[PDB]
Amino acid sequence: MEHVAFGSEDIENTLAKMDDGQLDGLAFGAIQLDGDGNILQYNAAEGDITGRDPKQVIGKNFFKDVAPCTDSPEFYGKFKEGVASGNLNTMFEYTFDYQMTPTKVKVHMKKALSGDSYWVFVKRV
């Protein structure tokens, strides 16, 4: 179990050293997206929250395929502005309700250390 706290100010540096094996040891959900919203990494904790099987969602588009409930100005809109601008760091509450029991979460989106990749961190509230 990797000791990293949700919302840590230097979270991008710490997660840069993790492979999709060490990501599964986080206490919160973590998804890594490319600039188009395609899923590059998806950890075990996220699968526990949402029911998705990590290996099966990698490669899919988060906003178009996996999470249509996030295709809105309040989530996808913030992501798109972040990708276009070059920086992103925002935290907000949201409800995930597609093909699942509605679940309230806290989401933290932040640009990764690498060029065109972005993190989406999730925890229950």
Method: X-ray
The end-to-end CA distance of the chain, in Å, is 21
Going from the N-terminus, what domains does the chain have, and what CATH number goes with each? 1-125 (3.30.450.20)
Task: Give the CA angle between residues 27, 15, 121 to the nearest 5°.
Answer: 50
Neighbours of 10 (CB within 10 A): 9
Task: Give the CA angle between residues 59, 17, 75 to the nearest 5°.
Answer: 45
Q: How far is CA 75 from CA 22, 98, 108, 123, in A?
A: 27, 14, 11, 16
Specify the length of the chain in residues: 125
Q: How far apart are CA 122 and CA 91, in angstroms?
A: 10
What's CA 47's distance to the chain center, in Å?
11
Count CA atoms within 13 Å of residue 87 on its CB side: 1
What φ, ψ does residue 36 adopt, rounded to 5°? -95, -5
Q: How far apart are CA 43 and CA 46, in angstroms?
A: 5
Closest CA to 92 of 102, 79, 83, 81: 79
Q: How far apart are CA 19 and CA 105, in angstroms?
A: 25
- DSSP secondary structure letter of residue 17: T
Give the DSSP H/E element, type plus range, for residue 55: helix 54-57
Cβ burial, residue 33 (10 Å; 0-12/13-18/19+) = buried
What does this entry list as its resolution, in Å? 2.5
- Whether residue 116 contacts residue 35, with contact meaning beta carbons closer than 8 Å, is answered with yes
